[PDB]
């Protein structure tokens, strides 16, 4: 039968605007399926009639429409664990691991999932030149939505990029740049969804502004890939999902180089659920509408907790 | 002087060990001139009468049974004298993060990884630290014979104090050991048994402490009774090891401590086989501070008294948070 769902969204991370967009979509979708939905901005509280345009007693599950920060890195998950509350997405350890890109890439390698060489800042000019080369990617260790990320083409560009990434967290990653195509794989309850490609044109990376403006980039589900490469991307994403002990759903990002080899960048335990977002498009390609997707995520969270 | 809240007790199978650790830490910090509040996380901030009775309780031969645990279930720094469960697996750490409180030991990711022995061992190998072959239940008897063979160790993935652990010498013993380990958590490890010597390395503030050896006599493993009954086993600090082996154990323990992003202090356990190879079992982020505990003995061997050790752990927590 129908659920009472509290959709937690907003928060105080650099991905707050993305989270508000996700929360708005999920609230409408679950209401469309006849569930009772309570909208909670975790930076303010329970929204009234106008703001949407005690009561949480009897809530079956908290839908975590949050992105980044304490909402995605395990902190909120542990808070809800300690309160005995059911929630969607991955648990405390799994969420904390997937947000730490450094730790996650060590586990990718342990699972047989290819990933680009990297160093954590600070790194000397010698270490960078010997192990990484140019161009390279500087990114915060625990951000999302491409926040804080720079492409570094020469040694003189490195320090400003590290300082930029350092404004968004305590650790900074220097990663070998993988030239090629942009591929992403959603997982829903231990099943891979159709692979998607993001067509970047002349751009080096998939940045914040192109991730969340409608029509800024073309996104193709199922991607126009040789069947064996798409099957490999799905095989690897499931290995990542299982390796980090994720639950419910996830979305894994790959770079596909000009030689046909896939390189795993990261996995996201709370991927975007907006209109332009990648995971809903992969689900729709699999035949799963957005409302059904939201309900299934709810029930997977209930079963786990 | 500081104002310290010592959190202890909890509702894990290591509750009695935690009470014993908290009692020592509270006593030592009060001797050093600090104001100390005692907090059993199973109830709350204790009054003097409930403090007096709780802290006098000694660790028993067996851990607190499930039925007993069912009934149980201006501060400068929170000293976490807890062991296991939510007190050590990152849950409480995240609680304290969210409240902006300073606490001792490792953060919430680091604590969660060290309690998950499976994940920790993957990171051991990533850091160049040897560790024994292992499988996670469910594993077919076919897989077990092919990968591990006998003897092997069955242990809960996320316990401590040797709770739920069995040595399996034959096929018939395997299923009962897995059922036992499953009464103490959701995940169960099967690990190749390493015959040899029992070696442990404390770390304090990114420095290794003198290596210790636990002399087990004829016992194959270091169990709950022998860990906490006084005089049950002889423990040697600094261990009587070839210097190159002790120095390698210390190098590896520091690699483990840094690999899992631990903070403050830790204690890493190894088995040393007859060929001189070290095999890393686990690292503990909230090691015991009881009167029979290993970390205080390593600290003492480095010239660090117990009260000073407690104070230094406090200040490392304040500086981190
Ligand atoms: N090593 C790399 N090589 C090439 N492009 C990269 C690399 N790392 C990141 N990028 C680009 O930056 C984007 C964001 O990187 P990602 O690692 O997915 O972090 P985020 O969590 O911010 O999405 C990717 O979608 C990709 O376009
Ligand atoms: N693979 C193994 N080989 C030999 N002895 C083991 C092994 N694993 C555990 N033990 C024994 O069991 C004890 C507890 O195991 P450990 O991995 O340290 O778990 P705990 O977190 O319960 O201390 C060890 O001190 C050791 O005596
Ligand atoms: N974390 C963002 C927001 O929702 N989905 C995301 O994926 P990412 O941009 O991290 O690749
Ligand atoms: N976890 C226990 C209690 O404090 N220190 C301990 O180490 P372990 O027995 O886990 O090796
Ligand atoms: K991530
Ligand atoms: K441990
Ligand atoms: Mg991400
Ligand atoms: Mg990404
Ligand atoms: Mg342990
Ligand atoms: Mg141990």
XYZ file of C-alpha atoms and ligand atoms in Angstrom:
708
model
C 0.000 0.000 0.000
C 0.938 3.680 0.118
C 3.781 5.155 2.147
C 4.357 8.231 4.270
C 7.635 9.667 2.948
C 9.633 12.623 4.266
C 11.768 14.053 1.450
C 14.908 15.623 2.931
C 16.537 18.147 0.616
C 18.551 21.349 0.463
C 21.257 21.088 3.083
C 24.316 23.315 3.236
C 26.719 21.823 0.688
C 27.890 23.428 -2.546
C 25.290 21.205 -4.274
C 22.310 22.741 -2.447
C 20.727 24.152 -5.615
C 20.990 20.741 -7.291
C 19.432 19.182 -4.187
C 16.467 21.582 -4.227
C 15.827 20.631 -7.854
C 16.036 16.923 -7.000
C 13.751 17.288 -3.987
C 11.105 19.136 -6.001
C 11.016 16.355 -8.627
C 10.852 13.525 -6.075
C 8.100 15.193 -4.027
C 5.882 15.645 -7.091
C 6.589 12.123 -8.350
C 5.778 10.347 -5.078
C 2.605 12.412 -4.692
C 1.656 11.367 -8.232
C 1.839 7.741 -7.061
C -0.497 8.542 -4.148
C 2.019 8.541 -1.295
C 1.848 11.118 1.495
C 4.938 13.323 1.183
C 6.413 15.736 3.734
C 8.925 18.216 2.297
C 11.807 19.065 4.648
C 14.535 21.572 3.817
C 17.247 20.450 6.236
C 18.546 24.037 6.397
C 15.185 25.389 7.612
C 12.549 22.757 8.344
C 9.139 21.452 7.372
C 7.775 23.531 4.495
C 4.379 25.175 4.799
C 1.776 25.607 2.086
C 3.338 28.732 0.561
C 6.967 27.604 0.829
C 6.168 24.387 -1.040
C 4.417 26.414 -3.759
C 5.422 15.992 14.980
C 4.049 15.571 11.477
C 7.072 13.295 10.931
C 5.513 10.758 13.317
C 4.682 7.572 11.439
C 7.016 8.284 8.513
C 7.904 5.032 6.747
C 11.143 6.259 5.159
C 13.214 9.409 4.715
C 13.987 9.967 1.035
C 17.424 11.599 0.954
C 17.234 14.106 -1.916
C 20.445 15.692 -0.624
C 23.750 15.920 -2.503
C 27.239 16.354 -1.098
C 28.521 17.252 2.337
C 27.029 15.717 5.458
C 23.931 14.559 3.577
C 25.909 12.214 1.315
C 29.189 11.470 3.157
C 27.703 9.215 5.848
C 27.121 11.848 8.536
C 23.347 12.106 8.081
C 23.144 8.345 7.535
C 24.698 7.780 10.967
C 22.370 10.344 12.561
C 19.387 8.455 11.143
C 20.919 5.098 12.130
C 21.163 6.283 15.737
C 17.540 7.426 15.673
C 16.365 4.113 14.235
C 14.986 5.801 11.112
C 14.738 4.183 7.688
C 16.227 6.073 4.756
C 17.070 5.675 1.075
C 20.470 5.148 -0.507
C 23.583 3.640 1.023
C 24.557 3.258 4.672
C 27.114 5.137 6.743
C 30.300 3.300 5.751
C 29.331 2.912 2.088
C 28.373 6.587 1.772
C 31.570 7.773 3.486
C 33.742 5.566 1.240
C 32.141 6.669 -2.032
C 32.530 10.338 -1.121
C 36.269 9.925 -0.400
C 37.434 9.663 -4.015
C 40.932 8.595 -2.908
C 39.690 5.689 -0.759
C 37.129 4.707 -3.407
C 39.802 4.463 -6.124
C 41.921 2.178 -3.921
C 38.887 -0.094 -3.639
C 38.251 0.138 -7.392
C 41.753 -1.251 -7.921
C 41.234 -3.958 -5.299
C 38.074 -4.988 -7.192
C 39.800 -5.140 -10.584
C 38.276 -1.866 -11.822
C 40.660 0.283 -13.854
C 41.238 3.797 -12.522
C 43.670 6.579 -13.358
C 46.892 7.130 -11.434
C 46.708 9.799 -8.757
C 48.491 11.667 -5.985
C 47.116 13.607 -3.034
C 48.299 17.172 -2.521
C 50.919 18.316 -1.715
C 52.974 16.839 -4.568
C 56.390 18.010 -5.710
C 57.174 19.065 -9.265
C 59.176 15.834 -9.571
C 56.383 13.511 -8.404
C 53.877 15.206 -10.717
C 56.190 15.114 -13.730
C 57.233 11.483 -13.187
C 53.920 9.874 -12.221
C 51.155 12.009 -13.773
C 52.315 14.219 -16.637
C 50.242 16.945 -18.241
C 47.454 17.837 -18.566
C 46.135 16.586 -15.214
C 42.990 16.998 -13.130
C 42.961 18.738 -9.756
C 39.759 18.102 -7.830
C 38.596 18.184 -4.215
C 38.678 14.716 -2.703
C 35.053 14.896 -1.503
C 32.998 17.185 -3.731
C 30.391 16.622 -6.443
C 28.897 18.279 -9.519
C 32.461 19.161 -10.687
C 32.721 21.740 -7.889
C 36.284 22.931 -7.363
C 37.774 21.017 -10.315
C 40.409 22.394 -12.706
C 42.311 21.063 -15.710
C 46.015 21.853 -15.230
C 48.037 22.127 -18.447
C 51.413 23.164 -16.990
C 53.290 23.263 -13.702
C 52.586 26.992 -13.254
C 48.828 26.301 -13.228
C 49.068 23.668 -10.484
C 49.247 25.732 -7.286
C 46.224 27.979 -8.093
C 44.206 24.855 -8.902
C 45.168 23.194 -5.612
C 44.254 26.375 -3.725
C 40.892 26.429 -5.524
C 40.134 22.794 -4.709
C 41.217 23.453 -1.120
C 38.411 25.965 -0.603
C 35.956 23.051 -0.830
C 37.432 20.445 1.513
C 40.453 19.188 3.395
C 41.999 16.852 0.788
C 42.912 17.550 -2.838
C 43.478 14.964 -5.570
C 45.817 15.206 -8.568
C 44.656 12.670 -11.179
C 45.904 11.765 -14.646
C 43.646 13.262 -17.303
C 41.913 10.637 -19.449
C 41.218 12.030 -22.905
C 38.214 10.595 -24.667
C 34.487 10.161 -24.127
C 32.231 10.613 -21.091
C 30.197 7.583 -19.977
C 28.016 6.925 -16.929
C 26.282 3.811 -15.580
C 23.368 3.763 -13.174
C 22.630 0.792 -10.925
C 19.226 0.024 -9.380
C 19.024 -2.827 -6.835
C 22.001 -4.891 -8.057
C 21.051 -4.413 -11.740
C 22.860 -2.200 -14.238
C 20.817 0.311 -16.228
C 21.545 1.249 -19.863
C 24.826 3.093 -20.355
C 24.707 6.823 -21.061
C 27.121 9.071 -22.939
C 27.504 12.801 -22.342
C 28.601 14.567 -25.530
C 30.988 17.325 -24.439
C 31.929 18.691 -27.861
C 35.219 20.525 -27.599
C 35.097 20.709 -23.806
C 37.651 18.883 -21.678
C 35.363 18.144 -18.712
C 31.683 18.003 -17.741
C 31.412 21.096 -15.546
C 28.848 22.521 -13.116
C 27.115 24.800 -15.605
C 26.677 22.134 -18.293
C 25.466 19.557 -15.761
C 22.304 21.461 -14.795
C 21.153 23.694 -17.676
C 18.627 22.075 -20.000
C 20.109 21.360 -23.410
C 23.602 22.536 -22.456
C 24.870 19.090 -23.508
C 23.386 16.124 -25.340
C 22.998 12.989 -23.213
C 22.363 9.683 -24.994
C 20.693 6.657 -23.369
C 21.500 3.963 -24.454
C 24.899 5.318 -25.517
C 26.070 4.733 -29.095
C 28.838 2.342 -28.048
C 30.072 -1.020 -29.308
C 28.049 -3.605 -27.357
C 31.145 -5.074 -25.684
C 32.255 -1.697 -24.307
C 28.803 -0.926 -22.903
C 28.623 -4.408 -21.371
C 32.038 -3.873 -19.778
C 31.013 -0.499 -18.345
C 27.980 -2.185 -16.767
C 30.073 -5.081 -15.451
C 32.532 -2.641 -13.872
C 29.827 -0.429 -12.336
C 28.217 -3.427 -10.628
C 31.644 -4.436 -9.322
C 32.102 -0.909 -7.921
C 28.603 -0.892 -6.405
C 29.194 -4.240 -4.696
C 32.794 -3.395 -3.715
C 31.815 -0.283 -1.745
C 28.801 -2.161 -0.269
C 26.325 0.328 -1.734
C 22.572 -0.149 -1.409
C 19.510 0.780 -3.427
C 21.053 2.657 -6.349
C 24.159 4.516 -7.528
C 25.692 6.138 -10.592
C 29.279 5.486 -11.677
C 31.278 7.813 -13.949
C 33.841 6.580 -16.509
C 36.132 8.070 -19.103
C 36.452 6.050 -22.315
C 39.793 6.611 -23.976
C 40.572 6.554 -27.684
C 41.896 2.973 -27.369
C 38.583 1.591 -26.086
C 39.596 1.320 -22.413
C 37.320 2.430 -19.562
C 38.657 4.390 -16.580
C 36.514 4.701 -13.451
C 36.409 8.202 -11.957
C 33.969 7.867 -9.053
C 30.660 6.460 -7.860
C 27.808 8.588 -6.486
C 25.458 7.155 -3.862
C 22.945 10.048 -4.069
C 22.918 10.883 -7.795
C 20.818 13.679 -9.199
C 17.077 13.131 -9.494
C 16.188 16.310 -11.399
C 14.713 16.769 -14.875
C 18.079 16.899 -16.678
C 19.635 14.209 -14.479
C 21.448 11.121 -15.713
C 20.127 8.380 -13.422
C 16.428 9.004 -14.262
C 17.307 8.926 -17.972
C 19.062 5.569 -17.580
C 16.048 4.250 -15.667
C 13.668 5.492 -18.372
C 15.749 3.731 -21.023
C 15.323 0.535 -18.983
C 11.546 1.066 -19.046
C 11.239 2.507 -15.521
C 9.303 5.754 -15.239
C 10.342 8.407 -12.764
C 7.533 7.835 -10.249
C 8.150 4.082 -10.214
C 11.876 4.740 -9.772
C 11.241 6.937 -6.738
C 8.875 4.390 -5.167
C 11.299 1.523 -5.753
C 14.114 3.489 -4.104
C 11.802 4.085 -1.126
C 10.997 0.397 -0.742
C 14.633 -0.652 -1.135
C 15.511 1.726 1.693
C 12.737 0.311 3.878
C 13.832 -3.278 3.238
C 17.439 -2.459 4.150
C 16.620 -0.612 7.385
C 43.696 21.552 33.146
C 40.810 20.286 31.003
C 37.145 19.452 31.473
C 36.715 15.932 30.088
C 33.593 13.843 29.534
C 34.558 10.161 29.474
C 32.000 8.183 27.450
C 31.974 4.453 28.148
C 29.798 1.376 28.474
C 27.502 1.307 25.471
C 25.522 -1.698 24.282
C 28.112 -3.665 22.312
C 29.487 -7.068 23.310
C 32.564 -5.181 24.585
C 30.535 -3.216 27.162
C 32.321 -4.787 30.141
C 35.721 -4.043 28.582
C 34.568 -0.468 27.957
C 33.498 -0.033 31.589
C 36.959 -1.221 32.648
C 38.692 1.177 30.241
C 36.537 4.123 31.299
C 37.223 3.415 34.971
C 40.994 3.611 34.419
C 40.785 6.730 32.244
C 38.477 8.538 34.680
C 40.763 7.665 37.601
C 43.939 8.706 35.771
C 42.599 12.027 34.487
C 41.203 12.931 37.908
C 44.624 12.160 39.400
C 46.192 14.556 36.875
C 44.017 17.385 38.218
C 41.310 17.415 35.537
C 37.568 17.696 36.024
C 36.015 14.503 34.657
C 32.362 13.702 33.956
C 31.455 10.014 33.651
C 28.884 9.167 30.965
C 27.565 5.673 30.278
C 26.228 6.031 26.733
C 23.564 3.420 27.589
C 21.920 5.770 30.108
C 23.434 9.216 30.561
C 25.690 11.384 32.682
C 26.141 9.400 35.889
C 25.783 10.545 39.457
C 28.387 9.555 42.016
C 26.438 6.553 43.331
C 25.797 4.992 39.918
C 29.377 5.833 38.911
C 30.770 4.053 41.973
C 28.927 0.793 41.264
C 29.342 0.677 37.470
C 33.083 1.373 37.380
C 33.897 -1.170 40.112
C 32.677 -3.999 37.855
C 35.443 -6.235 36.510
C 35.470 -7.922 33.114
C 33.983 -11.403 33.355
C 35.141 -14.638 31.727
C 32.478 -14.338 28.997
C 31.120 -11.175 27.314
C 27.719 -9.831 28.409
C 25.079 -12.128 26.958
C 22.490 -11.029 24.409
C 19.656 -10.995 26.962
C 21.601 -8.725 29.316
C 22.563 -6.400 26.459
C 18.907 -6.320 25.386
C 17.882 -4.824 28.735
C 20.724 -2.298 28.456
C 19.812 -1.395 24.862
C 31.648 23.493 28.917
C 33.364 20.193 28.181
C 36.707 20.602 26.422
C 36.837 17.094 24.939
C 34.914 13.820 24.944
C 37.260 10.928 25.696
C 35.773 7.910 23.908
C 36.464 4.970 26.231
C 34.039 2.828 24.194
C 34.775 -0.383 22.306
C 32.891 -1.844 19.368
C 29.454 -1.173 17.961
C 28.342 2.396 17.363
C 30.985 3.754 19.744
C 33.863 2.618 17.530
C 32.397 2.116 14.034
C 32.017 5.817 13.206
C 28.372 6.256 14.219
C 29.088 8.119 17.463
C 31.931 10.016 15.780
C 29.494 11.364 13.178
C 27.048 12.226 15.985
C 29.802 14.273 17.628
C 30.876 15.844 14.320
C 27.310 17.038 13.733
C 27.203 18.550 17.222
C 30.558 20.287 16.803
C 32.081 18.423 19.751
C 35.742 17.535 20.131
C 36.517 13.874 20.772
C 39.491 11.522 20.928
C 40.586 8.904 18.436
C 39.768 8.650 14.763
C 37.076 10.312 12.674
C 33.939 8.696 11.365
C 35.186 7.364 7.998
C 38.474 6.139 9.515
C 36.652 4.422 12.382
C 34.136 2.773 10.046
C 36.860 1.378 7.789
C 38.921 -0.035 10.664
C 35.903 -1.830 12.160
C 35.059 -3.416 8.787
C 37.859 -6.004 8.793
C 37.149 -6.967 5.153
C 37.514 -3.404 3.854
C 40.513 -2.713 6.108
C 42.339 -5.758 4.739
C 41.729 -4.543 1.182
C 43.352 -1.252 2.175
C 46.201 -3.131 3.887
C 47.086 -4.745 0.568
C 46.729 -1.408 -1.234
C 49.290 0.041 1.189
C 51.728 -2.854 0.800
C 50.841 -4.504 4.121
C 50.632 -8.293 3.893
C 47.395 -9.870 5.131
C 45.979 -13.384 4.998
C 43.710 -14.708 2.256
C 40.033 -14.409 3.080
C 36.467 -14.994 1.943
C 33.177 -13.467 3.075
C 30.254 -15.733 3.938
C 28.329 -17.201 2.179
C 31.113 -19.316 0.659
C 30.531 -22.799 -0.702
C 32.500 -25.570 0.982
C 33.939 -25.977 -2.521
C 35.240 -22.384 -2.572
C 36.625 -22.707 0.957
C 38.679 -25.826 0.222
C 39.957 -24.280 -3.012
C 40.983 -20.864 -1.630
C 41.671 -21.231 2.104
C 41.747 -24.878 3.150
C 42.000 -25.860 6.788
C 42.784 -24.651 9.411
C 41.002 -21.309 9.053
C 39.547 -18.633 11.314
C 35.873 -17.682 11.289
C 35.241 -14.267 12.812
C 32.532 -11.614 12.669
C 33.545 -8.887 10.258
C 33.063 -6.115 12.816
C 33.674 -7.429 16.321
C 36.494 -7.012 18.832
C 37.934 -8.773 21.885
C 37.814 -12.071 19.914
C 34.008 -12.134 20.284
C 32.377 -14.676 17.990
C 35.664 -16.094 16.673
C 36.451 -19.775 16.086
C 39.314 -21.835 14.713
C 37.959 -24.338 12.210
C 40.126 -27.431 11.808
C 37.723 -29.532 9.714
C 34.656 -29.290 7.477
C 32.253 -30.412 10.209
C 33.267 -27.453 12.405
C 32.711 -24.821 9.704
C 28.932 -24.310 9.614
C 28.619 -24.086 13.441
C 31.406 -21.495 13.495
C 29.683 -19.389 10.830
C 26.399 -19.593 12.753
C 28.198 -18.475 15.925
C 29.858 -15.512 14.207
C 26.506 -14.509 12.697
C 25.047 -13.982 16.183
C 27.387 -10.980 16.557
C 26.894 -9.069 13.307
C 25.703 -9.135 9.724
C 28.942 -10.077 7.911
C 31.239 -13.040 8.588
C 34.878 -13.507 7.542
C 36.719 -16.734 6.734
C 40.470 -16.169 6.937
C 43.473 -18.443 6.504
C 44.879 -19.359 9.913
C 48.449 -18.117 10.425
C 50.367 -20.283 12.867
C 53.085 -18.514 14.784
C 53.552 -15.742 17.310
C 51.161 -13.022 18.488
C 52.485 -9.479 17.991
C 50.858 -6.066 18.462
C 52.015 -2.504 17.701
C 50.649 0.646 19.292
C 50.803 4.001 17.524
C 50.613 7.380 19.272
C 50.682 10.653 17.308
C 52.150 9.175 14.103
C 54.870 7.303 16.030
C 55.171 3.576 16.643
C 55.477 2.342 20.220
C 57.611 -0.621 21.346
C 56.394 -3.919 19.907
C 54.643 -6.337 22.243
C 54.329 -10.111 22.117
C 51.528 -12.148 23.679
C 52.773 -15.588 24.752
C 49.871 -17.960 24.119
C 51.526 -21.175 25.283
C 49.610 -23.931 23.538
C 46.614 -21.807 22.556
C 46.108 -21.156 18.864
C 44.349 -17.810 19.426
C 44.133 -14.969 21.930
C 40.578 -15.220 23.254
C 38.261 -13.099 25.415
C 39.077 -14.901 28.667
C 42.835 -14.578 28.216
C 42.642 -10.951 27.063
C 41.067 -9.647 30.285
C 41.467 -12.124 33.153
C 44.480 -10.862 35.092
C 47.582 -13.025 34.769
C 46.003 -15.337 32.183
C 48.795 -14.822 29.619
C 52.260 -13.284 29.711
C 52.739 -10.124 27.639
C 56.237 -8.862 26.820
C 57.039 -5.208 26.044
C 59.405 -4.708 24.252
C 58.940 -8.094 22.575
C 61.886 -10.500 22.362
C 62.082 -10.291 18.572
C 64.956 -10.005 16.111
C 65.381 -6.236 15.694
C 64.628 -6.314 11.959
C 61.282 -8.017 12.595
C 60.226 -5.584 15.334
C 61.213 -2.642 13.128
C 59.198 -4.082 10.235
C 56.119 -4.526 12.442
C 56.432 -0.862 13.418
C 56.863 0.259 9.804
C 53.797 -1.735 8.754
C 51.670 -0.474 11.656
C 52.433 3.127 10.686
C 51.533 2.347 7.069
C 48.212 0.910 8.297
C 47.534 3.891 10.572
C 48.150 6.345 7.728
C 46.372 4.272 5.059
C 43.084 4.243 6.986
C 43.482 7.958 7.888
C 43.457 7.237 11.624
C 44.073 9.956 14.221
C 45.476 10.158 17.726
C 46.368 6.547 18.432
C 45.712 2.967 17.336
C 46.845 -0.598 17.924
C 47.536 -3.076 15.116
C 47.620 -6.874 15.483
C 49.923 -9.234 13.549
C 50.685 -12.930 13.342
C 54.368 -13.763 12.817
C 54.929 -17.060 11.040
C 57.886 -19.427 11.408
C 59.552 -17.944 8.302
C 59.627 -14.443 9.805
C 56.767 -12.993 7.741
C 54.282 -10.607 9.372
C 50.562 -10.956 8.591
C 48.302 -8.063 9.579
C 44.961 -9.065 11.127
C 43.298 -5.746 11.992
C 43.786 -2.286 13.421
C 41.805 -1.000 16.413
C 41.025 2.721 16.685
C 39.783 2.607 20.308
C 42.148 0.032 21.847
C 41.739 -1.134 25.402
C 42.879 1.010 28.308
C 42.081 -1.507 31.069
C 44.594 -2.694 33.666
C 45.463 -5.716 31.477
C 45.491 -3.804 28.181
C 48.232 -3.768 25.546
C 48.398 -0.130 24.412
C 49.203 1.218 27.925
C 52.026 -1.337 28.211
C 53.542 -0.216 24.903
C 53.236 3.406 26.038
C 54.952 2.561 29.335
C 57.797 0.832 27.477
C 58.364 4.103 25.587
C 58.532 5.971 28.897
C 54.965 7.325 28.789
C 52.971 6.837 31.979
C 49.268 6.091 31.862
C 48.035 9.483 33.079
C 50.272 11.240 30.548
C 49.038 8.920 27.784
C 45.426 9.784 28.625
C 46.223 13.504 28.684
C 48.091 13.330 25.370
C 45.190 11.506 23.715
C 42.893 14.280 24.995
C 45.042 17.058 23.551
C 45.402 15.304 20.193
C 41.611 15.179 20.020
C 41.248 18.872 20.847
C 43.827 19.833 18.214
C 42.162 17.706 15.522
C 38.600 18.907 16.179
N 40.842 11.897 -14.570
C 39.972 12.563 -15.367
N 40.123 12.600 -16.709
C 39.262 13.261 -17.505
N 38.196 13.944 -17.056
C 37.929 13.987 -15.731
C 38.818 13.286 -14.796
N 38.322 13.491 -13.558
C 37.208 14.258 -13.694
N 36.979 14.548 -14.989
C 35.862 15.365 -15.520
O 35.292 16.108 -14.437
C 33.947 15.659 -14.181
C 33.694 15.539 -12.685
O 34.609 14.576 -12.177
P 34.171 13.474 -11.092
O 35.418 12.693 -10.760
O 32.985 12.729 -11.653
O 33.750 14.309 -9.773
P 32.287 14.888 -9.357
O 31.993 14.142 -8.075
O 32.492 16.368 -9.145
O 31.342 14.547 -10.480
C 33.821 14.319 -14.881
O 32.475 14.067 -15.296
C 34.776 14.451 -16.048
O 34.142 15.136 -17.134
N 44.126 -15.329 10.518
C 44.452 -15.609 11.802
N 45.444 -16.477 12.104
C 45.775 -16.763 13.375
N 45.164 -16.230 14.443
C 44.143 -15.351 14.279
C 43.724 -14.980 12.924
N 42.714 -14.098 13.052
C 42.502 -13.916 14.378
N 43.362 -14.659 15.100
C 43.410 -14.727 16.570
O 42.193 -14.169 17.059
C 42.486 -13.000 17.832
C 41.475 -11.910 17.537
O 41.451 -11.673 16.135
P 41.376 -10.168 15.579
O 41.429 -10.250 14.069
O 42.445 -9.381 16.304
O 39.890 -9.733 16.074
P 39.453 -8.813 17.334
O 39.025 -7.539 16.654
O 38.307 -9.631 17.886
O 40.673 -8.709 18.218
C 43.883 -12.575 17.420
O 44.558 -11.865 18.466
C 44.554 -13.887 17.087
O 45.007 -14.522 18.286
N 26.809 14.668 -6.966
C 26.155 15.102 -8.242
C 24.709 15.668 -7.920
O 23.769 14.467 -8.195
N 24.493 13.632 -8.995
C 25.902 14.037 -9.020
O 26.870 13.315 -9.717
P 28.355 13.988 -9.921
O 28.171 15.391 -10.442
O 29.073 13.970 -8.593
O 29.043 13.106 -10.945
N 38.672 -4.169 20.617
C 39.425 -4.608 21.837
C 38.998 -3.719 23.079
O 40.059 -2.589 23.089
N 41.089 -3.062 22.328
C 40.738 -4.346 21.704
O 41.517 -4.863 20.671
P 41.071 -6.272 19.958
O 40.639 -7.244 21.029
O 39.924 -5.951 19.029
O 42.294 -6.776 19.227
K 31.315 10.388 -4.994
K 39.049 -3.240 14.288
Mg 30.456 12.826 -7.768
Mg 30.975 12.682 -11.389
Mg 39.840 -5.652 17.082
Mg 42.572 -7.985 17.729
